[PDB]
Design a protein around this ligand. Structure first.
Ligand SMILES: CC(C)CCC[C@](C)(O)[C@H]1CC[C@H]2[C@@H]3CC=C4C[C@@H](O)CC[C@]4(C)[C@H]3CC[C@@]21C
Ligand SMILES: Cc1cc2c(s1)c(-c1ccc(C(=O)O)cc1)nn2C(=O)c1c(Cl)cccc1Cl
Length: 240
């Protein structure tokens, strides 16, 4: 029942930090930006669109940090390892979380109160990267991830003992094994083991997120936003 407790606690942390309620996201699917509203976004400066997106993304990261902090055993890891795991995984989790807010039927994402396609972001001049992010969401949406599946899978995105630079690898391994067991046990219970073969190849998420963060760093170098820094040890690793 320790494993059943872990599922409960991981799902609770997810529920408290998921940002956007699934029921809201699904209900709002019909609420789509008009051609006029799309043009409005496309006409905005690259730099205004950057400010908006950067602020949304830092907020998304911060919810992922809060998620991690409420995972059993995470706070008992040394700060070095906490940072190593967050620096490697927090944005990967954000990209995974996007799939909930993505509608495969019309290739739109929920953004600033309505659904819009990737063309909403034209002013940023990142069409290939953004298309790749949308495509990643388009792939994941075919899994029809449940909320508990997202919670358990994203916990594992973070708690990965293979990240270079861990000081107490065996401590991270122990957390990882318990989370893997929780996830696999849960899939068996719900007759959802079929998703295991369909999950992203790990390299895919890594390279996509690496390219994403690279682009965020470029924008930040050219036109830095001011961040409401909630987690100084992590902030210090990403900003300079
Ligand atoms: C490279 C960047 C300059 C441009 C990235 C453009 C994206 C891919 O077009 C970004 C912009 C805003 C981003 C979203 C901002 C906040 C959220 C809430 C979070 O809970 C899930 C992801 C989600 C829904 C993001 C998904 C990707 C987005 C939708
Ligand atoms: C793996 C991680 C990637 C990433 C993290 S963590 C953070 C972040 C944010 C806030 C805090 C905090 O203390 O409140 C700590 C960390 N920003 N970020 C970015 O890619 C990013 C963004 Cl979202 C916007 C502009 C520039 C950049 Cl570089």
């Amino acid at each position: 029942t320790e494993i059943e407790h872990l599922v409960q606690s991981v799902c609770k942390s997810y529920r408290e930090t998921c940002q956007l309620r699934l029921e809201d996201l699904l209900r709002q699917r019909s609420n789509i930006f008009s051609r006029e509203e799309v043009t409005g976004y496309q006409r905005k400066s690259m730099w205004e669109m950057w400010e908006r997106c950067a602020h949304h993304l830092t907020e998304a990261i911060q919810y992922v940090v809060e998620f991690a902090k409420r995972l059993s055993g995470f706070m008992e890891l040394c700060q070095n390892d906490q940072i190593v795991l967050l620096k490697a995984g927090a944005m990967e989790v954000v990209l995974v979380r996007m799939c909930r807010a993505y509608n495969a039927d019309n290739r739109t994402v929920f953004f600033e109160g309505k659904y819009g396609g990737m063309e909403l972001f034209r002013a940023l001049g990142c069409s290939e990267l953004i298309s790749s992010i949308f495509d990643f969401s388009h792939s994941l949406s075919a899994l029809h991830f449940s909320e508990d599946e997202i919670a358990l899978y994203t916990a594992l995105v973070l708690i990965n003992a293979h990240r270079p630079g861990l000081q107490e690898k065996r401590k991270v391994e122990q957390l990882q094994y318990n989370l893997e067991l929780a996830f696999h046990h849960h899939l068996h219970k719900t007759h959802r083991q079929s998703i295991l073969a369909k999950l992203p190849p790990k390299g895919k998420l890594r390279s996509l997120c690496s390219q994403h963060v690279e682009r965020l760093q470029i924008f930040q170098h050219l036109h830095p936003i001011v961040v409401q820094a909630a987690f100084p040890p992590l902030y210090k690793e990403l900003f300079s």
